[PDB]
Amino acid sequence: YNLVIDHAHGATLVDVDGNKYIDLLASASAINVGHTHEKVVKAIADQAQKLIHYTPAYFHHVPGMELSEKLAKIAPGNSPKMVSFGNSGSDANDAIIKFARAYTGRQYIVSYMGSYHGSTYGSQTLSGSSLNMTRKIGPMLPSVVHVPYPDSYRTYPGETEHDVSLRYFNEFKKPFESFLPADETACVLIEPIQGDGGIIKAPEEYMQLVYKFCHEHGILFAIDEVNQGLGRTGKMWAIQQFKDIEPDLMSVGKSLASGMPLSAVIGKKEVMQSLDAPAGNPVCSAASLATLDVIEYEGLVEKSATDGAYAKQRFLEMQQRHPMIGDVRMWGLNGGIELVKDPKTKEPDSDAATKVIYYAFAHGVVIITLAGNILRFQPPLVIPREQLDQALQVLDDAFTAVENGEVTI
Amino acid sequence: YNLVIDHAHGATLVDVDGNKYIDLLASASAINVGHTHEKVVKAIADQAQKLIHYTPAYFHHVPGMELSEKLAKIAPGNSPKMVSFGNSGSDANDAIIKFARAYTGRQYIVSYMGSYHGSTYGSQTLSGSSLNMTRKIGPMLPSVVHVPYPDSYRTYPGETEHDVSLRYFNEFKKPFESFLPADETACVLIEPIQGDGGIIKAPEEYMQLVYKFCHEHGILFAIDEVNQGLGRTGKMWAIQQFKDIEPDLMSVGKSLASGMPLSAVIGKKEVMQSLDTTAGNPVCSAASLATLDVIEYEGLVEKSATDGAYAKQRFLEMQQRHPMIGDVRMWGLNGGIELVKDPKTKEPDSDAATKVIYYAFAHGVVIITLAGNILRFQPPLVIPREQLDQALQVLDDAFTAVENGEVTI
Amino acid sequence: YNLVIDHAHGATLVDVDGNKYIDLLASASAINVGHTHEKVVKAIADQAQKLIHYTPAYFHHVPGMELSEKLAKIAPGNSPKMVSFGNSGSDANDAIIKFARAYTGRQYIVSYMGSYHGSTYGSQTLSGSSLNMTRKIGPMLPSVVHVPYPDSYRTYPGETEHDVSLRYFNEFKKPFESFLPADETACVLIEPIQGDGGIIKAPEEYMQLVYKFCHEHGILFAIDEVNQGLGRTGKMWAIQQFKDIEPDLMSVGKSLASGMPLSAVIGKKEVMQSLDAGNPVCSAASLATLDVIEYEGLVEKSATDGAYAKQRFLEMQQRHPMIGDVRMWGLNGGIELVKDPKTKEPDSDAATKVIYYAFAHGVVIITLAGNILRFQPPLVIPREQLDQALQVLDDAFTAVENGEVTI
Amino acid sequence: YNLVIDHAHGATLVDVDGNKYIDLLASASAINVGHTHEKVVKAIADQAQKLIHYTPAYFHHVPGMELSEKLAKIAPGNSPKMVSFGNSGSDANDAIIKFARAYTGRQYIVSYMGSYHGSTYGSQTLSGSSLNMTRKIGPMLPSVVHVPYPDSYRTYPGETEHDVSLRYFNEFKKPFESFLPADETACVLIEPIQGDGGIIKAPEEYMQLVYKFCHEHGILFAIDEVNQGLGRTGKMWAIQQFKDIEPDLMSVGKSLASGMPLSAVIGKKEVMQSLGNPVCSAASLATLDVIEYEGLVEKSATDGAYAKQRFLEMQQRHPMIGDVRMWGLNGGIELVKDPKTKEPDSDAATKVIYYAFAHGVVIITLAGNILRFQPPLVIPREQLDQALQVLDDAFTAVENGEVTI
């Protein structure tokens, strides 16, 4: 924005002029635990003194070593895990293909519509989000198939939620009853809940079906936790929001260390040993350890859930007074609050979603839209309930603003 | 390396037992400035006080603005440039492919055998050092073609450095005169002096031939300077070892940030204009600024040259007593010590190198090998002479022991 | 049955032991005109006298030249065509991808599920029915996206031809809305009716929705008349079962020369010159087979014979219920067998029994996707045979309803 | 060219006006048996009355079977074989990619620069012929690598045969000693003598040394003789000009059915196992007998060595003929601006081709400075001498400089 950024602590952002802003984008999930958090600043700085950089290849450092343990330990499920480290969720998704393809000796990758696994040649190929248009830069990474994601808002007449999971599971089956063998596809990468596609969840009835087909045909079941991890959902991992799921392979990046360039691939021991190198960094390891501690100490996973239920209840009543709110998809501090021209037609109102970004930003609170009309509500999980209401307030006048036909551009 | 590192500073590494070593490796030249340099340590620690992360698209930031100017000034050439961020050497090289293809509307990439470019599907594919970067993970990025790089030691009886360039240039042109059309190759991509090849420099004549070729046929000329720039070589960058060449694109990762995971694409203003996650990081740019400071303040480039030159003559003297050091190729504090059985046959001595490197470790110097038998000598540029004299002395005796066979596994 | 065929004529495979069979075969279109039609034979025989082969990339020759012009006028639309000569269906469909990639400047190709466009590395990618065919041969041609063909049988609880087209065109756009760029998409290949996947036709709305999307976004609109052309559907071309749709590209094989290895790519003048660029005998066979379809009026014959046979194939369904669905457009149908018309679950068991019952009673008939018996006799077929083949199949429905048919 | 044809017999061609020409192009060597040989015409005649085409994807027929036991035996090597049929030499190598990939389980195919494997996306990635190249139709089929072919004419001053074999093999490995996992390469497909590349034979040592390598790694060693087969070369297959090499997979085409669309993949049984036209098959049935009975393997060897000699004496006077390659009635005759720089002289190649055709011999250029001497193998000595004089004159009517474009 025209006036550029200075410092920030928890939820308050401060730019060059001293202007105060309430945060809700939280850097596409990273700011899980606020900005400049004292234990994580202390850990950064105290580590930078000891050793800035050495690589997991040739030498061990301690914190990355202490980190690895804590990440196999915290990981979803009980099977013996192992972590590989990366720089970004972007490069950890690449790895998930490398691993998948190695263990299974297989080529094809089934990734999703609506999804955004990243920005390197492999993770850019796996994605398919609105803005995320890989124009001019093809050909992409070969042997990748896409499959639709269970849309819940936009449906045929009289579909139950049981029906969605049947109709989208049918769509998912469709290439495997055609051109894609099953004994050839090495991996299904799924967002348990989609980020960029508009804070969309898949029904459990669906994921289980997908988590069976994967298990029945030997195709690795990988989950992308870069955006929806570390309490964001109200449980510690988005995958846990479903009953009994043990991902073969999982990615996390971004959030892991309050925005320091770190990432992990957490999967099964036998999967993690089909390559062996060269087919980690200390300060962000130290930061990771510091954020992990904060997640556990401040009851943050719970704060994610308790504030998460509350905010749902605030967007529900607020939808009642402003019929433009077409859907509200909250699971944790984790909203998908999407605007529509009419509630019958459910047509996007990207016009109305951008105006609300303008009112928000101009009246002391920062938020953004995903694919056009859905506002992504992903605030830092240490937002004092106070600050949150002042966000909700402004988000509310802004609704009425655009309703009464107030702010222009 | 059978170890855990406690702490480090400059060109010394301290293990947890308390032992010290000269870091002759410099951790794949991520450390030209050394470990934990004061100005970097206070760059990291002060900026973490203020901002840990926010991507340069919602609010932009103070050092994310500064380094993004300060990077473009200092590139090789006169011509307007913009610079895009990332984290790794790898992920910047993905971006090269991208910027190249986009600009041109073309499809193919040309890369060299024996170069490492990274471990993301893009960069991973262009490489040609170790075979594990394909194995079990195919297919690789489409439309990529590996040519040979010039070797100036393993020559056919009596080739003058002209014959090397012209024979390798001829072996260069062959894909274009067979299956590959010059009008769909977006870019050559080439490390000015290879790393994992064996610190191997292409002749001037080879470079201008390839360079003109690129401009004649609309192919962009790209350089990987991850290993070889930032004072490494003798001049600030490795291209300035050649008469007026100007990169269309250029990458650096690694030593951009005294070890931190930040990285830069530097394209010619035109190439960059088509498009533009932990990338840009405020702590990291802070770190990176400080280390350019030091390259200037501490005279690191002019020093790199002189210490480099000195380090070359002691090996040239060390070659003379010792029959085994086949090639000593070196530019700045940056050389390769390819040991061989006999100096006529020119046949790899993988054994003698390991023997050299092991003994060195159990004598207070950490050096490592490449392509079997080549001693990778790329220390921190800040190295004090006394230590530079000490590593040098240790390695001299290493040579003496092997010739006696006084070394064993 | 390791069935060794010695000689043939019209709609009569006769083997080596002296047996007589009623063809209605398949493995894609092949026998539109008929077996060893005196017209065709004579032309090959006498063309053989003159010329075996001299590749047109050197000298030119008369039959090729007549059949370049012949096909260029007689292929649907107004726009000047030019026509490029492949050896088989495969190397016409491989060339659509060339032809579209060269003209548009765009890499991506959009093709259908349950389709089959050819067996070489280009077209095999495009295809999508035979899982067999795409095992242990990766990687295939890069940039190719698959979109589900319209299924008018297995609907959702009482939906309309209008509901289907939307639902199926939504899916068609899902790619374009996520990861595929419409402006980097060279073309969509589409069989106007899927051959090797159960004789299945897009509703009218779906074709105009796609065609309209194609043209607006700069994507060429490809048709495949490999299986479905040459008066099979009852019009000269399957695309002419739809309204004012002139292809940008069009592939034909098989019966182009009654069987003699010939295929054509027939697009627009401009499109066909994008690249920097046909057997004498095969072309004389073809040039005859083209006169036959006009002369014996086999386009007109199919339509009538076909609808007649539709009502015939449909009262069979109200006595014998196992037939879920009767699909027929001209002498071009696919009779589809199920457990129960509420479950619609394939009963491929019953089907391979009818093919065996019928193989024992002088009538060869091979199956699609297990349960779907494909129905593609040679169009020359006389009514006494058609009925002598149609009565049999009915007798079979009786027999497989009994468990009289065992293996 | 701008010319329409009407009839041809054996060696001789005739356009619709009546100007008689002589074949040397020979339909890119699809006409080995000669044009409209009676046994072949009588074969298509007979069988087209019997069956045009019924679909092979299902049940069987007799001409195919007879051919598929015939070919199967006349293959090179003593190991058991199985054949697979296509419509063209292009789709046949498309199978060679496929088959290799099923058997081995590996992706990477390795093909040679200057290679002509054909024109579908499979054998057009394999291919490496410049004037046959694949602009605006990329992306091409992944995991195809192009190692360079031994050119035994452009050498660096004073290299033995052995040297070229050492060096091009040292090029061969450079992929594998760097980015290409040898244990993940499905097959090396090679033309033994490169057709469209310029009539270029691989040295004895180099072929062995690849066969060796390939054998050492489970890399299926493959051969395309779409061009160079059926006795074009003086031996039956062109491979038998080498020492005890058994192909894992071979590709036959073109002159299989005297030009009628017919292809073949002749493989070791073991390789084909675990993964066609009734008229054209009959056509090949006869064309094989004509090769056999009219005794052509040997005629090609005999006329081939007469053709070689005369040409080497043509070079003694005309120093524009910089290289004379020849193996059977099969040769490249490379035109150069200079006996010592060896610069391609296209310009002249153009005019040579212009003269010759003006005087009733057909002949064309390979990479625009190599004349593709490849007549039908039943060209009588008479005609063969008529061309050799009409070519002889051409070189001198360009030495004097008369021919115009």
Task: Please name each of the domains of chain A with its CATH number.
Answer: 1-36+299-409 (no CATH), 37-298 (3.40.640.10)
**Is the CB of A316 inside 8 Å of chain C's CB atoms?**
no
User: 3-state DSSP call for residue C189?
Assistant: strand
**Is the CB of B142 inside 8 Å of chain C's CB atoms?**
yes
Distance separating alpha carbons of residues B123 and B92, to the nearest angstrom: 8
User: 3-state DSSP call for residue D4?
Assistant: strand
Q: Burial, D223: exposed, middle or buried (Cβ in 10 Å; 0-12, 13-18, 19+)?
A: buried
Task: Return the closest-CA partner of residue D267 out of D221, D214, D216, D207.
Answer: D221
Pick from D121, D259, D277: CB nearest C52: D259
Distance separating alpha carbons of residues A271 and D39, to the nearest angstrom: 63
Distance separating alpha carbons of residues D385 and D383, to the nearest angstrom: 5
Distance separating alpha carbons of residues B204 and B238, to the nearest angstrom: 12
Nearest CA in chain B to D155: B167
Which residues of D fall within a CB distance of 8 Å from A121? none
**Is the CB of D179 inside 8 Å of chain B's CB atoms?**
yes
Q: Contact at 8 Å (CB) between A24 and A378?
A: yes
Chain A with chain D: Cβ pairs closer than 8 A? 5
CA A174 to chain centroid: 27
Distance separating alpha carbons of residues A35 and A27, to the nearest angstrom: 10
Distance separating alpha carbons of residues A315 and A337, to the nearest angstrom: 8
Sequence-ordered list of residues with C-beta below 8 angstroms from that of B160, at least 6 positions apart, any chain: none
Contact C146 A145 (CB under 8 A): yes
Distance separating alpha carbons of residues B350 and B233, to the nearest angstrom: 26
Task: Return the closest-CA partner of residue B149 out of C105, C145, D174.
Answer: D174
**Is the CB of A49 inside 8 Å of chain B's CB atoms?**
yes
Place of tokens 């002159």: D255
Which residues of C fall within a CB distance of 8 Å from A176? 131
Give the alpha-carbon dihedral of B138, B139, B142, B146, to 10 degrees. Answer: 50
Record the tokens describing residue B242, joined without a space.
Answer: 């050649």
Sequence-ordered list of residues with C-beta below 8 angstroms from that of C99, at least 6 positions apart, any chain: C84, C249, C265, C267, C271, C272, C274, C275
User: 3-state DSSP call for residue C13?
Assistant: strand
Record the tokens describing residue B279, joined without a space.
Answer: 């990338």
- Identify the H or E element spanning C222: strand C220-224
Task: Return the closest-CA partner of residue D221 out of D151, D172, D161.
Answer: D172
Q: Could you tell me which residues are beta bridge partners of residue D321?
A: D335
3-state helix, strand, coil in chain D (%, to 5): 40, 20, 40
Whether the CA torsion A280, A282, A287, A291 is positive or negative: it is positive
Task: Return the closest-CA partner of residue A94 out of B115, B144, B94.
Answer: B94
Record the tokens describing residue A289, joined without a space.
Answer: 């350890």
Q: Burial, A348: exposed, middle or buried (Cβ in 10 Å; 0-12, 13-18, 19+)?
A: middle
Q: How distant is the Cα of D315 from the closest Cα of chain A, in angstroms? A: 49
Q: Name the resolution in angstroms.
A: 2.6
Interface test with D, best of C52, C60, C125 (most D CBs within 10 A): C52
Q: Burial, B208: exposed, middle or buried (Cβ in 10 Å; 0-12, 13-18, 19+)?
A: middle
**Is the CB of A180 inside 8 Å of chain C's CB atoms?**
yes
Q: How many beta carbons lie within 10 A of that of residue B363, not counting itself? A: 17
Q: Contact at 8 Å (CB) between D138 and B108?
A: yes
- Identify the H or E element spanning C20: strand C20-22
Residues A308-325 as b/e (b if ≥16 CB within 10 A, e otherwise) read bebbbebbeebbeebebb
Contact C178 A114 (CB under 8 A): yes
Q: Could you tell me which residues are beta bridge partners of residue C13?
A: C8, C21
Distance separating alpha carbons of residues D322 and D338, to the nearest angstrom: 8
Q: Could you tell me which residues are beta bridge partners of residue B339?
A: B325
Amino acid at residue number C248: D
φ, ψ (nearest 5 deg) of residue D239 = -65, -30
CA C265 to chain centroid: 15
Neighbours of D, requiring at least 3 CB pairs below 8 Å, are A, B, C
Q: Where are the alpha helices (DSSP H) in C296-382?
A: 298-319, 348-359
Distance separating alpha carbons of residues C13 and A69, to the nearest angstrom: 73
**Is the CB of B139 inside 8 Å of chain D's CB atoms?**
yes
Sequence-ordered strand ranges (E) for A70-219:
81-86, 108-112, 144-147, 185-190, 193-194, 200-201
Q: How distant is the Cα of C250 from the closest Cα of chain D, in angstroms? A: 17
Q: How distant is the Cα of C114 from the closest Cα of chain A, in angstroms? A: 6
Task: Return the closest-CA partner of residue C206 out of C214, C197, C198.
Answer: C214
Pick from C128, C175, C181: CB nearest A178: C128
CA distance readout (Å), A65 to A62, A84, A93, B140, B408: 5, 11, 22, 32, 31
Contact C36 D16 (CB under 8 A): no
**Is the CB of B308 inside 8 Å of chain A's CB atoms?**
no
Q: Contact at 8 Å (CB) between B88 and B263?
A: yes
Give the side-chain half-sphere CA count within 13 A for B308. Answer: 23
Which residues of C fall within a CB distance of 8 Å from D62? 4, 6, 16
Distance separating alpha carbons of residues C201 and B191, to the nearest angstrom: 56
User: 3-state DSSP call for residue C273?
Assistant: helix
Distance separating alpha carbons of residues D378 and D352, to the nearest angstrom: 24
- Specify the length of chain D in residues: 405
**Complete DSSP assignment for C84-95:** EEESSSHHHHHH
**Is the CB of D157 inside 8 Å of chain A's CB atoms?**
no
Which residues of D fall within a CB distance of 8 Å from B108? 138
Task: Return the closest-CA partner of residue B5 out of B370, B256, B259.
Answer: B259
A224 is in an annotated binding site: yes
Distance separating alpha carbons of residues A293 and A212, to the nearest angstrom: 35
φ, ψ (nearest 5 deg) of residue A329 = -120, 90
**Is the CB of B184 inside 8 Å of chain D's CB atoms?**
yes
Record the tokens describing residue A318, joined without a space.
Answer: 């607020």
Record the tokens describing residue A235, joined without a space.
Answer: 């449980």
Pick from A1, A36, A53: CB nearest B260: A53
Question: To 10 degrees, what angle do helices C204-216 and C161-178 make?
Answer: 30
Pick from D113, D139, D171: CB nearest B143: D139
Q: Contact at 8 Å (CB) between C177 and A149?
A: no
Q: Contact at 8 Å (CB) between B286 and B44?
A: yes
CA distance readout (Å), B223 to A121, B187, B246, B248, B253: 19, 10, 9, 8, 13
Q: How distant is the Cα of C117 from the closest Cα of chain B, in angstroms? A: 24
Which residues of B fall within a CB distance of 8 Å from A139? 107, 141-143
Chain C window 329-368: which residues touch D at a Cβ cutoff of 8 Å? 366
Q: Contact at 8 Å (CB) between B192 and B99?
A: no
Residues B110-144 as b/e (b if ≥16 CB within 10 A, e otherwise) read bbbbbbbbbbbbbbbbbbbbbbebbbbbbbbbbbb
Say if strands D193-194 and D200-201 run parallel, antiparallel, or are unpaired. Answer: antiparallel
Task: Return the closest-CA partner of residue B92 out of B272, B341, B287.
Answer: B272
In angstroms, the first-to-last Cα distance of chain A is 14
Record the tokens describing residue B9, joined without a space.
Answer: 């500073």
Contacts by residues D17-20 (CB-CB < 8 Å, ≥ 24 positions apart) = D19/D360, D20/D360
Distance separating alpha carbons of residues D143 and D127, to the nearest angstrom: 13
Contact C128 A167 (CB under 8 A): no
Say if strands C185-190 and C108-113 run parallel, antiparallel, or are unpaired. Answer: parallel
Q: Contact at 8 Å (CB) between D194 and D200?
A: yes
**Complete DSSP assignment for A332-389:** SS-EEEEEBS-TTT--B-HHHHHHHHHHHHHTTEE-EEETTTEEEE---TT--HHHHH
**Is the CB of B200 inside 8 Å of chain A's CB atoms?**
no
Contact A101 B136 (CB under 8 A): yes
Q: Contact at 8 Å (CB) between B56 and B64?
A: yes
Record the tokens describing residue B233, joined without a space.
Answer: 């070589």
Distance separating alpha carbons of residues A382 and C156, to the nearest angstrom: 47
User: 3-state DSSP call for residue A171?
Assistant: helix
**Three-state SS annotation for chain B:** CCCCEEEEEECEEEECCCCEEECCCHHHHCCCCCECCHHHHHHHHHHHHHCCCCCCCCCCEHHHHHHHHHHHHCCCCCCCEEEEEECCHHHHHHHHHHHHHHHHCCCEEEEECCCCCCCCHHHHHHCCCCHHHCCCCCCCCCCEEEECCCCCCCCCCCCCHHHHHHHHHHHHHCHHHCCCCHHHEEEEEECCEECCCCCEECCHHHHHHHHHHHHHCCCEEEEECCCCCCCCCCCCCHHHHCCCCCCCEEEECHHHHCCCCCEEEEEEHHHHCCCCCCCCCHHHHHHHHHHHHHHHHCCHHHHHHHHHHHHHHHHHHHHHHCCCEEEEEECCCCEEEEEECCCCCCCECHHHHHHHHHHHHCCCECCEEECCCEEEECCCCCCCHHHHHHHHHHHHHHHHHHHHCCCCC
Q: How many beta carbons lie within 10 A of that of residue B297, not counting itself? A: 10
Distance separating alpha carbons of residues C374 and C377, to the nearest angstrom: 9
- The CA-based angle A102-A105-A109, given to 5 degrees, is 80
Q: Contact at 8 Å (CB) between C240 and C223?
A: no
Which residues of B fall within a CB distance of 8 Å from D197? none
Contact B5 A59 (CB under 8 A): yes
Distance separating alpha carbons of residues D273 and D83, to the nearest angstrom: 10
Residue D247, preceding bond cis, omega within 30 degrees? no
**Complete DSSP assignment for C124-155:** HHH--S-SGGGSS-----SSEEEEEPP-SSS-
Distance separating alpha carbons of residues D365 and D131, to the nearest angstrom: 11
